[PDB]
Structure formats: structure tokens, C-alpha cells
């Protein structure tokens, strides 16, 4: 009986794979980007990447290849999952809908076999005769491509070589032939076999096993024109083919290992090479033509081209463009030129995509000190290290604050017919109208000609022909720029009001009730045109001359009031077209027609806060999509605002919301604001690119943030951040950091570039004498980062070979100071495990960093929380509790010894603690007895932990080694000595991510209990919450209903995916819910959504409301 | 050196 819920807050952003080809059309260039469980399909364009399709799969993508057999009009896609799900995919565009269809699938894991060296490798023959897998040592699995084999049946062949580094299929080979680098005793070797599938054996390869260098790792199979194989080692590159043998050993490449490649030119004249450094190389093969003799290979050379992000994945695209898949850093779109720039680089970045990278550690802070957490991650590694500040929502910056408990509308006002700046904001009021002349930045309420102050303005637009309108309770007044008085003024042929106002900068379309007139601000006078009567009372109206119309406006739309409807119409005629019947007893408060890039949009807000959304047609215009949200609980006013190239829709509610744009879609993110009642663009000479926004009581004006649901602000550290703490009193962060350095010829160590610790504002080194006794090395630092500016205020460098692994910001003992304590450790590469380390206690003062105390240890300090005014640490395998002498020193109180390796600890308010490396988790208490540890209980399973949390008094979350999550609790049980001494795994669940950090916090607010945020190696940020048994049960059920209804991509079974799994056991998931899947619900059609129900009560869209309520936890 | 391995593990593969 454990009941948890897990959702993704941020999808993985690291890039594991990327592959290029024609997957969308025979004539289309696509870049397929593989995150972890996310496949991203693009079309390469002049601008770069046209997003087209983003699906998620039920597994971690380990293999991703495009291929095209015969008769096949375009490329199909092969994908192997890490749980050995193999599938084959096809891009299907049902004219206007899109689908990725599974042409074949099946699971290719084998009970036999130990997962090999260099991990899964999936290759595919040039002729497409088969697919070659290397899942295990000794085996080589072959999946024969045939029209059938829709279940991907496969055979294994025995592989004599038990240790294969890399393999490819050779080109221009009659028989399917593989080429591989393998390792034995006495070096590495390149060797070949034909693959005859009609016998299920191998056969001899075309060329004799040559040798390759000790560190050979990549095999490139050169295309048909050249044929053969390139082998890439350290400091050396070689070419093999039959008796042909070519070798270069360019000094330049010794510096760092080549990690990745890519064919640039189809013939393979040219390849890209990726470095551990981020260096980019061109590999060039000098061809050679000899009449009556196809071609040969005279030479090959390497040229340094420049520098990218550390590249996992490289892919030449169109002309000089290269996509850079990055895992340690931000991914990027990059450009190659024939000419280098200034210090010498042929590489020029074009676009950078944000990778929250490896989140190595993180922490929550409301920096703005409101009631929302921002989250602050140590990210990336080496040159890509960064902090990322992550903040939900879209904010605005407030410039004035005028108390006006009334404002019932407001429109812009340029008082000078030249400047695109306005100096007035005439504003509807509680049955009034106030004008507002501005002295630039100042505020002033005065009169204005032909604009009634006694009456309630319902509009105020920017009517052309040198005129200013003010439509009122009564009727459309008129004022000039030239005359500036009472130029004209309409009035209802009966002394009845205008109910609903309209106007763009050229039209006027009011309503009287059921009535629908039409007036014009023609040169200096308002002339009448049409009149039509409607079934019911006009609720709301919209007109704006969309695209192909200068001021004068095409078709129309309206919501009415007893038949709560929205309908499509024309202009002077009012001829009714298609329509829609929305439900309930609440009338449409607002209707809208818009545009962004390539669609004309229609939305309709109701008084319950909900909104229905649809698209119209400038040419025709009819019905579109039908979905239903929950923005405010209050009626929503829709409006459109000035921003970047794509100006957008702002929704006014108790939950202010922006509606931007996705692919060609539209964003739905919160605006970080109390409540916005009405809202409009502005620009005054004293307030430019400003937005105006009145609430219950107050005008406000300011710019906008980004757009997404999450805003991220990066602090480039240029080295690898490791741990991170917030010392509030000091208004700064502590960050442990590590920089790499190389052996000097003095013997010392230099540095490869300026980092955050070398460009530090001030600085200091360890003096401490506790110890006495090319080549690369780490230099470690505590950095002091201002919380507002994110400047490195101070840098404290630790000793030669001292890694700093843990950090806390705490007060200790009676002592009233907040210290920064750092646990460290002396690492020497030969050693298995450090035997020496220290704890160091520091204070950061006015702007100072004092070494307040040190403390020898006989190990590596892995973690340390602040217990109860004491410092609980943890060294190599011993867990301790330090007391702070009044004499200001850390002295031992007690220690627990029964650990293989204590890596993590957390503290449940009370005297309770938890953690371990290969042996899952322990629970400990502090006994104010003799002041001792009592080991309360442990989990008796072989979990190699990576992260540990306490969700509550009895519930412990755990993440491990194998991308699983688990929960333990203490066994409430008779025989309270053994059953008591044991805690049971009451929840299991395969996440699919490696978790580095849990911490309590949330990114949201100012059903569910708790909020635990987690930070993963892939850039994925998730959330774990707790549930009621009934909520659990509701959701479990609905989890299963949902799986019947939803087509999973490669036809992977959801529950196969979520299955707690190791290469020693596989159990199904218990006590866990992916809201990821629950949430999936809303993307479903109401038909397929009805099925989800057939059965305290049962409903058809009660659940639609349960699920909404959830999406808002993050 | 297992400390180095763990540091490597946090940055994965």
C-alpha cells in the first residue's frame, strides 16, 4: 500500500542520437533527433529546421536508423529500445493528419547473454537484406528483412570473438559482410565475415584479419564508390580494404579522443569527426582516377575546422550546415565555410538549443522571494558547465501602480497623428469614463473633446482619417485630429443602447440586442449601412481585417444568449454559414478571430473560465477542432498583443494566460500575475513596447518574458559544476566546481581555458598542512555566486588532488553563524578508493571567505546533511555525527559502520536518517540516549543507488543504477525484531532516466500530498507526489482503460515499459502512476475518451476535470 | 578509482 504519482516537468533535452534522410517524402530532407524516449522529426530548410513531428516512445532509444529496401517509395525507420523493443516505422501523412505507423515489431532480447562491451549496436546492410544486432557477447543476432517478418523474427549466430568494440556492414560486398574491431589478449584486430542467412552461419570474410591499435574504437564503412573501412584510434587513423592499407598519425588528434563521425559527401570523399574537446575535424580521402579502372585511394588527411559543443551526434545537412547533437552541452545548428574567420575557425554557430544537460545537482529557491520556486541546476560538464535558473510561467515587469477599483475596459491612444507612441489611455469605468493624458511617464486625468465623462465608454480604437472614436453606453461618438471636437455622433433610431461594441481602425459593428447594425468612420462622418436581427441576444462580437484586407473586414463570428452558441457569418449581408452549439447555461463572454503565420483562428471564452477553440477560413470558414479548457474560473477576456514577429493572444482571467504558438499550433502558459481583468498593448514616450493591464484595482504596464511554460536563464561556468547550495543570509550560492588541467613541463598544471574559477572576482587557496606525501588532472573550487547577478564573487581552490564532493549551508551548535561546509577527498588514480579527505568549515562575511576550521578524515566524504544543529556526514562507508564545540571545532559524537558505501543521506525532521551504494537503503535514528545511532531497518535488495529521498515518516524514495524508482516502508508487523528490522519495497516503477538529485520543492503556486523534484542525467526534470488510496485506485484503473484506447508507437506495451527491471529481475510496476500517461488523456478524441468509461459514481468528462486539476502540480 | 567512477556516472555513458 504505497501510492505515488510521477510526472515529467521537463522532457529530456540531451541528444543521444540524430540521423538524416528522406523519411517524410522521397524529396524531403529530415533530421530525426533522438532524445531518450522522444523522437523529433524535422524538415531541413533554408532557415534550418522546420519542426514536423514529435512523438514519445515507451523506451529509451538505443538504435535509430533510416533505410530503404526495394519498391519502398521513401525511407523507413528502424528503432531499437533498451528493453530490446525492436520496431520499424513509417511516416504517414493522412493529408492533414500525421501518424507514425508500425510496419513491424517484436522483442529481440534473449534470456541467454550478458549485455556486451560498448552496449547495444544495431546495423543495417547497404542492400537492406537484413539488420545486424549486437546485444550480447558471443552472439550476433540477425533480423532478416522480408516483406513479412512483421514480428521481426531473428536468429543468433555464434561469435568467436567475445569482445567486439564496433561493427559495420561493408559496402560493395556481394554477400552481406560485416567488419569489426575486437579485443583479445595481445591487442586489437580488424576481422570480417560474410553473412549467409540461408544457412545461419557466418563464412569467411573477404579480407584477412589485420591488426589495429590498442585504442581503436570506431569503424567507418566507406560507401560504394571507394569501399573499405576506416578505423579510428587515439593519435592515429587507418584505412583497410583487401590488401590496401593506408595510415596517418596526425599529432593534432592525440589531444583528445574522437567520439563521433558523419559522412558529408555520399561518395565519402569527406567525413566530420567529433572530439572529447568539442573540436571538429574534416577527414578527407584523396581519391585517384585511372582510366579503365574505377578509382582508388591515394591519401587521407585531417583538418581542424573549429569548435562545437561536445558532440555525441554529428550530421551534415544541406550546404555547410551541421547539426550538433550534444549530451554534455547545449545542442546546436552550426555552419561551415570555405574561409576561416579571425583566430582561425571555419565553424560558425547559427543556433543553440538549450540542454539542461546532465543535471548533476540542483536546488530550489524563490529568488524573487514570492511563493514560487525557481530551480537552480548544476549542468553540463567541462566547457559546457552552467547553472540553469528555471522558472515556471511568464512574468511581466511593473512600472506604475495606479489604484483604480473599477476599470472595465481600456484602449491605447496616440494623441499625435505621427508618432506610433500613445499618450492617453481612455478607460471604461463603473458606468463612467476617465481620460488619461500622459506627460511622457507622468499621469493626468483631464477632459477630451467629444468624449463623454458621464457615460460608460465601451470602445476607443484607432480609427483612420485623422479621427478618435469613443463608443459609449449610448452611441458611437466622433472626434477629429484636425477639428478635435464633435465631428459626428451616431444614435440608435429609437433611443436604445449599444450592447456590444466593435471597430478595428476602419469598421464599426455594434449590436442593440438581437440587432446588428453597421457604421463607418468615413472622412469626417459616420455613415450607416446594414441591419439584421438574430434568434437571440448578441453576447459578443469580433472583427479585424485579417490579411488580404486593408482596414475593411471580410467574414464574421458571434456568440448569443439562450442558445449559448457561436456561429459563422458575412459582412453587410450577415448571411449565416456553419455554427456550433456549446453546452451548459453560461453565455459566451468573448469571441476572437486572429492570425499568426498560416491560419486564421477562432476562439470563444465562456463565463465559467473555460474556453472552446477552433480555426476559421478567410476564404470559406466553417468548423474546426473542439476542445475545452479551464483558464480562469472567472469569465475570460481575449485580446492580442505586440511582441516579436509573431504577436499573440492574451487571456484575462483570475488565471491570466498567454496563448502563443507551438509548431504552427498555440502555447498555453501561465502569466505570473495576481489577476488581470482587461489588457492592451501600449508604447508612450515614457513607456515603449509596454503592455497595460488592470485588475480588481490597479493599472500596470511592462514587457513580457519568453513564452514557454518554463523560462530558463543560463550562467555559463566554462567548467563542470558539481554541487550547489543556497546561503540566504548571504544572498548567494555556493557551488563546487571542477576544472581540468594538463601536466606542465615545469611538471605543474596549467589550464586549457579561462573558467569561472580563474576569472573569479577575488580568490584564495588552501593553506592547510594535514597531509605530506599531457597528464590530465582536476582542480576543485568552492565558488561564491551572487544571487542577483550570478557573478563569481569568490573562488576558493582546494589542495593539489583534493576533490570537493559535498556541500551544505548551515548554522551549527549554539554558534549563530551560517557556515558553508565542504566535504572533500584526496583522489589518486592508482588508488581504488581514497583513504584521506577533510571537512572544511567556511564563512563568507562582508565579501570575505574565511577557512574557519578543518577536520581530517580517513575517507572520501560522499554526502552531508545538517542534522539537528549537528553535522551528519558520511565518509567512504562510515556515517558520522559531528558536534560543533563552543570552542568552534567539529568533534565526533557517534558513527554507524554497517555500510558497503554510504553515498546519500536525508533527515526526516526527527532523529531519522537513510542511505547506501550497492545495497539499497538503511533507516537510522539518533538516540538522545548515550547519543548513539540505532540502525532501525533496511531494504534487503541489490539496488545500486544513485539518489535517495524521504517523502515522509514511513515512506522512502529511491532511484538506482538501472533507471528504476522504488519506495520502501517499515513493516508494521508482529514479531517486532525481524519483520521490524526489514522494510518492504511497496512501490516499483521503471522511470527510464538516471536520477542524480531529489529535493523537496515545487515550481508553481503563489488531491496530492508532497512535491519532490528530481533532476536527471538527461535534462529531464520530473516530480514525485503522494496519493489517497482512492485517487490511486481511480487512476490505476484509468491507467489501464487508457492503454486499450491508445496506440503506442512501435506497438510497445506500456506496462512492459513501466516494469521494474534489472538484468537480474523483472516485476510489474506497483504503487506508481505516470501522470505523463494520465495527462495523455486530454490529447484524446471525445469518442476514444468515452470508451475510457463504462463505469461512488461514473462519468464522461468528470475525468477531463480530474486530469486538468493534476496538470497544475507543475 | 571509485570516486572518479561515480563522478563519471553522474555525467553517464
PDB file of C-alpha atoms in Angstrom, chain A residues 811-814 865-872 881-883 907-913 926 928:
ATOM      1  CA  UNK A 811      24.255  27.141  11.202  1.00  0.00           C
ATOM      2  CA  UNK A 812      25.746  24.729  13.728  1.00  0.00           C
ATOM      3  CA  UNK A 813      25.563  24.346  17.566  1.00  0.00           C
ATOM      4  CA  UNK A 814      24.813  27.453  19.677  1.00  0.00           C
ATOM      5  CA  UNK A 865      23.138  16.981   5.722  1.00  0.00           C
ATOM      6  CA  UNK A 866      22.635  19.251   8.733  1.00  0.00           C
ATOM      7  CA  UNK A 867      21.001  17.070  11.339  1.00  0.00           C
ATOM      8  CA  UNK A 868      19.822  18.959  14.427  1.00  0.00           C
ATOM      9  CA  UNK A 869      22.389  21.619  14.943  1.00  0.00           C
ATOM     10  CA  UNK A 870      24.917  18.865  14.274  1.00  0.00           C
ATOM     11  CA  UNK A 871      26.757  17.953  11.072  1.00  0.00           C
ATOM     12  CA  UNK A 872      25.939  14.455   9.938  1.00  0.00           C
ATOM     13  CA  UNK A 881      27.622  12.764  13.526  1.00  0.00           C
ATOM     14  CA  UNK A 882      29.784  15.741  14.294  1.00  0.00           C
ATOM     15  CA  UNK A 883      29.294  18.156  17.119  1.00  0.00           C
ATOM     16  CA  UNK A 907      16.930  13.540   7.527  1.00  0.00           C
ATOM     17  CA  UNK A 908      13.343  13.345   8.483  1.00  0.00           C
ATOM     18  CA  UNK A 909      12.846  16.273  10.828  1.00  0.00           C
ATOM     19  CA  UNK A 910      13.237  13.972  13.787  1.00  0.00           C
ATOM     20  CA  UNK A 911      16.317  11.948  14.531  1.00  0.00           C
ATOM     21  CA  UNK A 912      15.734   9.763  11.434  1.00  0.00           C
ATOM     22  CA  UNK A 913      18.347   9.285   8.522  1.00  0.00           C
ATOM     23  CA  UNK A 926      19.542   9.230  16.679  1.00  0.00           C
ATOM     24  CA  UNK A 928      19.396  11.090  22.734  1.00  0.00           C
TER      25      UNK A 928
END
